Structures are given as C-alpha cells and as structure tokens.
C-alpha cells in the first residue's frame, strides 16, 4: 500500500471518516454538517502527513466540540464554516509549505523516502572560512559535511564532491572555487539509510550553485544517484517521492531514466500538473536547472 | 459457615455477575472441603475475604448536567478553562450518546500543578470514588496483577485492594507515574497493563491470584504521567494527552 | 556541558553561520577564523527540544567577536538553518512563563509560532514586547547598534 | 508455558482458538518490524 | 557390508537447488528425510534439549 494525493484524502475523509467520527460522538448529520470546504481547507493546510490519522484526530476534535454545542450549548444545529472554523479547531499552524522561495544561492531542494512518507528536505551549505587565504595557496578546498551522516552517505557525499571539482574544469576553467575552499554542507536526517545515496544527485547541484553563485530555478525537485563519471542511476520507491514532491507545489522535477517505468504505472490523476524530465547523464540536468 | 453465610448474604445484595457467582460457588464447595484450621484455611479465607469485599454492581450513579461539573470543578479549581472545556465536551458527549462510556486520559505538566487534585475534584463531581495508585519506577507483577495464591504469602494486585477498598463497581481509578514505569525482562507490567486498558478485554480481567474474571466496564480509569514522549508507544497511541 | 550529539551538529552549523556573518558584514575583524574558543552549554533541556537553544548560541559568540555587550536581559530563542532562516520551536508557554518569572521585558520567536502564543491568558501578556522574525539578520540589529 | 509452571496458561493464539471457535480463522499479526530480538531468546525466531 | 554414515556440504548462489535435490536423495537411497534450520541460533540447549 502506498499514501494518499491531496485531493484523495477529501473523497476518503467525506464518506468512511466523518461519519464514523459522529458516530463516535453519537450525532446524527441533521445537527453537525460539516461542506466540503471545510475539508479542503484542513488537509491543504493543517495536516500535512501521508498518513491519514492525523486529519482523524482534526475531525475528532471538531465533532466533540459540536457535542456541547448541542448538549448545553446555544445552538440545536451546529453549522461549521470556514469563517466559523477557526473557533472550533483554532487558528491556522502551517501554511508556507516549503520555507525558502527565492532559494538564496547554494540550497536546492531534495527528496527523501523516509521512514514514513516522504518528505521534501533541502540541502544546505556554506563557506566555513576566507575564501583568499592565499592568491597562490594550494590546499584543497576540504568538505565537511553534516547532518546524522551514516558513514556510506559519507563515500557518496565525496564521489559528489569530486564529481563536482571535475565539472567545473570542464565547464569554467578561470573559476577555482571549489578546490581552493573549505565548505560545510548540510544534508538533514530522515532518510532510511538504504536510499541514503539516492540524495547524492541533489548534492552536485548544490555545489554548483555555490560555485557560481547564481540561484537554482524555483521549486525544480530532483534526486538522482551520480556515478563518480556522471552517469546517473535507478532510485527507489518513486510513489511516495512524487506524492510527498506533489504537497509541497513543486512543478517540475528531474528522474533518472531507469524509472522511466515506475513513474508510469501511477494512477493518472495522481500525475496531473507535474513536468517531468528524465535524464540519464548528469550533463543533461545541468541544462534543466540553470540557465 | 459462619463466615460463608456473612459473605451469602453480601452475595444477596451486591450482584454478582452470575458467572462469578457459580464460579464463587465451586470455590466455596473446596473451601468445604478445606479444614477449619489450615494454615491454607487461613490463605483462602482471607481470599473470600479480598474477593467477597470486591463490589460486585453496586453502581455509584453519576450527576450528568454539565452545570453541577461547571460548579464542582469551579469549586476546587480556578481558571485553566482549557482543561476543564476539555472535560466539559467529554462530559457533553458521553452525556448525549447514552450510557457511559470509557476513554483514558492523562494529564501531564509541573509537578504540584493540581494533576491529582483535579483527579479527586473530578471523583466527587462524577461521584465516582478516587483510589490513588502510583507505578513510577514499580517492576515486579505482584503489585499489578498479584500473586499466584498459591506462593507463600501471596496477597492480589493493587486493583484487587481497591475495589476492596471503594465499595462501588464503578469508580475513577487513578494510576500515577505512568511514565516511569519499570519495564523489564521480569515480567514487565507495562506491557501487563494492556490487559486493564484494553476497552473489551477490561471487561473480563482475570489475574492469577484470584483467578475469577473481573468485570470493569464501568469503571472510568484515568492516568498520570509527567512527559507524553518516554511512554511506550502501544500504551500511549490509545489515550488523548491533555496538558 | 554534558553535550548531547545533536547540539555538536547544531554547534557546528551555527558556528559556520557566525563565519560566514562576519564575513559578509565586518572584514576587518578576524577573530573566529584566528582563535579557539570555549563555550559551555549548562545542562537540564531534554533531548527532544536539544536544538531550540541553538539562536541563542550564535549571539553568544558574537557578543565576543565585536566585544560588545549584548543588550541588557533580552531573553531569545529559536532554530538557527545554517543559512539564517528561522524556524518553529515547541512549547513556548512554558518558555515565556518562565520568562516572565525571571523579569524579562522583551523576547524574539520564529514568526510561525504566531498562533500558539496567543492562546495566552491576558494577564500574560501584559507589559511585553514580541519581535517575530524569520531571517536571522532582523535580529543582528535588535541587539548591538 | 510448560502447565508445570507456576501460573501457566497457553500462548495467546490458543485463546484465539477458543474465542473465535474456527479451526481456519484470520490471525492477524501487528507490527513485525519492530519485533523484538533479543538475547533473551528471540521470539522472531520462535514465529518461524 | 553395512549401510554408513557421511557427511557432505554444498555451496553456492541461493536458489541454485541445494535444498530440492536434498529430498530428491532422500527417495533416492530410500532413508527419511527431516529438515533442521540452524541459522542464527545461539541456544545450545536447543540443540541438545
Ligand atoms: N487551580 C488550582 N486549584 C486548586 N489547587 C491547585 C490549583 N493548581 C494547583 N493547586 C495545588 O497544587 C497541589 C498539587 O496537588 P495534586 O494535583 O493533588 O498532585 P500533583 O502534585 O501530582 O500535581 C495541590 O495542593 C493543589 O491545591
Ligand atoms: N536443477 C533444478 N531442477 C529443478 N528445480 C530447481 C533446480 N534448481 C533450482 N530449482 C528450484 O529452486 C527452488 C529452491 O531450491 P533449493 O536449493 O531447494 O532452495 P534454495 O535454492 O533456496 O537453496 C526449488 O523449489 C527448486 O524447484
């Protein structure tokens, strides 16, 4: 079994969720309608879990609220309405889903089957000391990286890395900003340590935004697994990655080829609104993303 | 006789599930066979004694308007208005779907925040009897469940003594410390106590010492503990975490 | 001070952030990059909520880089994103009860926790004065100029 | 347990036996990842 | 003369055979068969009662 589309949970949640919840409050729908649109505005904002229980326990709390509205409270027909909403189940936690916008140079989204779910964490780094240690020094430009790393993320993270140094010299020989600087980079935990290379595309790009200096294009998710030579290879468990891509707005996003099928076999509705571009070699994806 | 007559005609008042009485009965035909002076005379009797003294129905009836709560949960407790809209829907609900019904709750925060004390205020607004039972650190399966009997000096579980204690069928049970209950290879009463929270399998607990089945739907069992994270996750996915 | 892992990454990212701030702010000083440092984080906040302490971490080490003191009992905290985005932290009534036991008159959150903090009774949050903020520089000019 | 010891009831499936009174019913086993394996004899070796 | 005992092993990728041609000797020389799984264990007592 897989998650649930955004849109999905409204068609779950109006039919073998509502009812049994007031059928845990005991009410009958004659008192305690709750429309469609207070659906819709729970799920795209308060809520964002693969899981279904946690709009359980929302949908919970409204109705047991409308209880003593009836019981003892004024109104005999509890209406809920957006306007009223807010009362009920307060105010709104979440709503700026995925934090940075303009993605200030050096951070570039990424996604990650975790455990449960999947969720779109960002990738991060930085300079860690003066870049002009020496107009003739030559020390190399050492990474650090960070964030929980299991110690097979850190072979990854150096064949990127390397990678990384070498398509510089093949795309801008005058530029030297990688070998001649230290860098922290920052990869947040969550992912299961059996696609912990599957982030590993994420990383080049990053690198390289920082080398330049320029700004990734807005919200162009990717993953990928790069190869020391920039061919790219399969990653797994495509589903949940694109429903957890489809909460967060992304309206783009980069695969390798291999799963030209997988990507496929998804219910068509789920695939609405996406613009996928599968590549193979890793110089195809510089051409997506920057210029 | 003597003693099997005073506990008969208990037996005549408090209703016993039918069950527990012919199994009472059996029980009574060996005690029958059992010798008036043995030491195991000794142990068993004093077994009718913790079993017979349980409340078997008796039935402390509840106030059900939500005004006599506002008073009462007022009359010993200032503010915290979240907490008390809280019980006021609980309230509010189990009093529109008919008959009583069972949810486990805790409350957690400070120490000396008024945990327990709105535990007590909320006995006497339901009237409902308050039995305090502290498992913070505890390890050892005797204190939950009991004794076999049949180990020397055997003596029932905690609940055993507050049913004896309480004299309703129904009270507000109220495990304390919750979070730091001992769970160990020994027997872990942590996972022992799903037996008392399972919302049906409560209803025919059965523990080695006395071995008869129990009957505690009616009883409205509440739970503290300090911090919702350290509680295992089978014990803490069931109940809500007020705070 | 009895460090748990997780703030030796937080450490870390903050420390990084302070480098990079100097850098892009005052050239002259050089301090960080050229001296060791100690910093002790006394014990007692659980595992859990380890990383909420971390905003405050970075004004600590630069009230010794520009050597100034920070501005007088200005009580913060936050989660720091090692690129000077702010994030939500949990809990804050306790927080800002014991902030008003300790006669704080001014404290700074993660503008996302905008909702929370008003469930508060009146009484609370009478005589204060909040600074909600998102990119770490707003609160680089709310304690040293 | 073995019945010689003290306070020996079968093993949970058997009550299902009793309760649901089907010779073919549907066990339905929770939660298998987090199984636990230990040195204290490994249960996940007993379900085998 | 008499029948005798003898030990054997066989090695390779999984899923070779190894176990099916184990039962296939078994009908073969007539003895019976009984398979015993001993990976991972660490009781010796199970082995030994
Ligand atoms: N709103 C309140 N009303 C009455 N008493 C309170 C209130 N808040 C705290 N207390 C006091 O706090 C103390 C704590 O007691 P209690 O809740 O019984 O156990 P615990 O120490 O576990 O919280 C009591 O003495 C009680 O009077
Ligand atoms: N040469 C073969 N002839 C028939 N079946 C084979 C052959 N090789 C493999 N198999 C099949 O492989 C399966 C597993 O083989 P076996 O060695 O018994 O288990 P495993 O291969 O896992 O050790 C069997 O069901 C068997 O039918």
């Given amino acids: 079994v897989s998650g649930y589309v955004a849109q999905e949970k409204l068609a779950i949640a109006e039919r073998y969720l509502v009812p049994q919840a007031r059928a845990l409050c005991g009410l009958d729908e004659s008192k305690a309608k709750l429309s469609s649109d207070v659906l819709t505005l729970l799920i795209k904002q308060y809520c964002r879990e693969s899981g279904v229980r946690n709009l359980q326990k929302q949908v919970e709390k409204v109705l047991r609220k409308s209880a003593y509205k009836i019981v003892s409270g004024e109104a005999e027909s509890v209406e809920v309405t957006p306007e009223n909403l807010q009362d009920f ?153 694109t429903i957890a891509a489809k909460r967060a707005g992304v309206t783009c996003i980069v695969l390798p080829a291999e799963n030209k099928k997988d990507f496929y076999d998804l219910a068509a509705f789920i695939t609405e609104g996406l613009e996928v571009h599968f590549v193979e070699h890793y110089r195809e994806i510089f051409d997506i993303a920057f210029p | 006789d003597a003693i099997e007559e005073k506990f008969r005609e208990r037996l005549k008042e408090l209703v016993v599930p039918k069950h527990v009485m012919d199994v009472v009965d059996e029980e009574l035909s060996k005690l029958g066979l059992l010798d008036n002076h043995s030491s195991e005379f000794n142990v068993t009797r004093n077994y009718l004694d913790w079993l017979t003294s349980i409340p078997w129905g008796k039935y402390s009836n509840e106030n059900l308007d939500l005004a006599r709560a506002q008073a009462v949960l007022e009359e010993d407790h200032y503010g915290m208005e979240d907490v008390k809209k809280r019980i006021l829907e609980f309230i509010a609900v189990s009093q529109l779907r008919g008959s009583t019904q069972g949810k486990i709750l805790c409350f957690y925060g400070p120490p000396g925040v008024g945990k327990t004390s709105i535990a007590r205020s909320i006995a006497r607004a339901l009237n409902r009897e308050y039995f305090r039972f502290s498992v913070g650190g505890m390890t050892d399966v005797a204190e939950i469940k009991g004794h076999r009997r049949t180990y020397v000096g055997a003596m029932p579980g905690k609940i055993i003594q507050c049913l004896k204690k309480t004299k309703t069928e129904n009270p507000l049970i109220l495990i304390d410390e919750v979070d730091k209950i001992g769970r160990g290879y020994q027997g872990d009463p942590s996972s022992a106590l799903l037996e008392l929270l399972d919302p049906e399998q409560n209803a025919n607990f059965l523990d080695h010492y006395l071995d008869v089945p129990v009957d505690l739907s009616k009883v409205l069992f509440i739970c503290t503990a300090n911090v919702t994270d350290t509680i295992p996750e089978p014990l803490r996915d069931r109940m809500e975490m007020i705070n």
């Fill in chain 1, 89 to 241: 189940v307060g105010k709104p936690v979440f709503t700026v889903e995925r934090m940075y916008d303009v993605t200030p140079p050096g951070v570039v989204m990424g996604l990650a089957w975790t455990a449960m779910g999947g969720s779109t964490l960002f990738v991060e780094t930085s300079l860690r000391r003066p870049q002009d240690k020496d107009a003739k020094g030559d020390k190399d430009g050492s990474l650090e990286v960070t964030g929980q790393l299991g110690e097979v993320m850190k072979e990854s993270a150096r064949i990127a890395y390397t990678f990384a140094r070498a398509f510089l010299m093949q795309h801008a020989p005058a530029n030297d900003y990688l070998v001649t600087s230290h860098i922290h980079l920052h990869v947040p935990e969550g992912a299961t340590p059996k696609d912990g290379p599957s982030a590993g595309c994420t990383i080049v790009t990053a690198l390289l935004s920082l080398a330049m200096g320029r700004p990734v294009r807005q919200n162009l998710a990717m993953t990928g697994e790069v190869s020391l030579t920039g061919k790219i290879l399969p990653v797994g468990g495509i589903k949940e990655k």
